[PDB]
Amino acid sequence: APLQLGKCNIAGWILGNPECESLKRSWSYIANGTCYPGDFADYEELREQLSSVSSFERFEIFPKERSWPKHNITRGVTAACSHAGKSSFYKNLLWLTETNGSYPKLSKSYVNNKEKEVLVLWGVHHPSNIEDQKTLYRKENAYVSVVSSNYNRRFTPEIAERPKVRGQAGRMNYYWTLLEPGDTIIFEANGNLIAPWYAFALSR
């Protein structure tokens, strides 16, 4: 039987758009997208990845309140993702910002210790201007590094004046990779990382 996303699409569901329900289960096919504007890398491949699963589990990959002691985990909400008439954010990601005047370099790793695949999603924030970049990340030049046994990318914030989309001039790109059992993913960044908070374990 199909997975019913109702008002949402796969992007809004899998990122955790606050308007979208967060779920083990299975389905044969899949029947509010990104509340923050941006590009979703490999989106159609992800739709196909998720099209039929035999067990699916949402799990807290990086516990929000215990993982990021040198960064701010609470101001990272936006009117673009509002909920209960208040600013909010994707339920599966975490918008890290500076604390105490600094955004130190972070380094965070996860090993898939399960006996099935793990789907990890993250984002990179692209401010519209350099003043907002400095306000949030305390430096004009930042990087996000994501490495696993078969994935290696370094992301550079693209700062540029852009049309307002859903009220926002900034953007947020979304990315993902899969981890087989025993594979390790490492996040390194000194700004702009929208960190994993919940990830997914699934089987084909």
Numbering used by the authors: 50 to 72, 75 to 82, 89 to 261
From the reporting publication:
HA is a homotrimeric glycoprotein, with each monomer composed of two regions: (1) the head, comprising the receptor binding domain (RBD) which is crucial in viral attachment, and (2) the stalk, that is responsible for viral and cell membrane fusion in the endosome.
In addition, we also solved a 2.0 Å resolution crystal structure of the refolded head of A/Fort Monmouth/1/1947, which appears quite similar to the lower resolution full length mature trimer structure.
